[PDB]
From a paper:
ERK5 is the effector kinase of a canonical kinase module comprising MEK (MAPK/ERK kinase) 5, MEKK (MEK kinase) 2/3 and ERK5 itself.
Compounds 2 and 3, like compound 1, bind at the conventional ATP-binding site, while compounds 4, 5 and 6 bind at a novel allosteric binding site. The allosteric binding site is a cryptic site that is absent from other structures of ERK5 and is located between the P-loop and the αC helix. The so-called gatekeeper residue Leu137 lies within 3.5 Å of the methyl substituent on the phenyl ring of compound 5. An ATP-competition study was therefore carried out to verify this hypothesis. A comparison of the IC50 curves at different ATP concentrations for the allosteric inhibitor 5 and the reference compound 2 shows that with increasing ATP concentration the IC50 values for both compounds 2 and 5 consistently increase. Kinase-selectivity screening showed compound 5 to be more selective than the type I inhibitors 2 and 3, with significant activity against only five kinases out of the 225 tested. Consistent with the differences in amino-acid composition of the allosteric binding pocket, compound 5 showed less than 10% inhibition when tested against a panel of MAP kinases including ERK1, ERK2 and p38.
Numbering used by the authors: 50 to 393
Write the structure that this text describes.
Amino acid sequence: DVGDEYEIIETIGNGAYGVVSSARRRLTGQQVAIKKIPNAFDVVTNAKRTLRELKILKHFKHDNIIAIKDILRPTVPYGEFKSVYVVLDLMESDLHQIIHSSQPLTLEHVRYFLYQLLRGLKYMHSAQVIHRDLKPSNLLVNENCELKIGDFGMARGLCTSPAEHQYFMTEYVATRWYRAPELMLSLHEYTQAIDLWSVGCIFGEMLARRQLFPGKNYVHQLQLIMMVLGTPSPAVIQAVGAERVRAYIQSLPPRQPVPWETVYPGADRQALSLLGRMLRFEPSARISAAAALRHPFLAKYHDPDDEPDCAPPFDFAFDREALTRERIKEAIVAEIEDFHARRE
Ligand SMILES: Cc1cc(Nc2nc(N)nn2C(=O)NC(C)C)ccc1Cl
């Protein structure tokens, strides 16, 4: 059941949320995507994640971030409510599908896709939200070339609970190929700078239409980053949590960084200038999303008056709480109610 307000067309694929249904609002004919989260309250970690995503997507109001158009209200008694139905914007493709296809992808495509990504990020980052899992598949693109950041399951603030495993096991946070050196190496510096490494990776991937660091495992991933970036500094090496990784990096002959001009021959000069400001071992050495929008490479689209920040910041306190499956269900049901009490 989809509240009798919608008409289901077909089951489509989604880069950010796996499998969704293309549908239409029966009154207006407006095309939408309907995500079903089956048995949503069965497992603690899944239930916590649904709550996190709902709170994050409700807090944001930005064209480059995926929006909740509607959330279906429980039709059955409370005890029987097991599946959540979320109405999202209908996004036909994603950046993974576009990069890795026979479709055009000129420097102008790259410039415009990076612009939309950084626009959405400047806003997200000012709310003290770190996506922590940016990748081409998570950057939804529609028929009108609108890029929208989706999939906030890995998202956290500047402060995290020690009660969760990823607080210590940072190398398991997100996707290997786009995972920031501070997460790979447990450098105890976890800011929005994490996302700018991932942006750099996506930027490189758009320029060559191939993954920049497609490591086969943990060590191989580090070897790939070090083949381009060179050996990390002694300060980065001293900050490495694990003794085996630290010893492994120290066991290697020194390597100087490879110029980006050698990595991407004949690629646009301003594109490579910006890329080098993102791909740095040191998180604090990286350009912020706001300063990147000021870079000459994005001058074409850059309008400071059309690139908002997000006020107030987003608070992750709800997520640090040890909540039972029932308490999470209660908090999700209260999000549905709030979403509806804020419209009417
Ligand atoms: C759009 C939206 C999506 C979710 N998705 C969600 N929650 C949980 N637990 N899994 N999940 C997935 O999308 N999983 C797939 C990747 C297989 C939750 C809330 C909202 Cl608003």
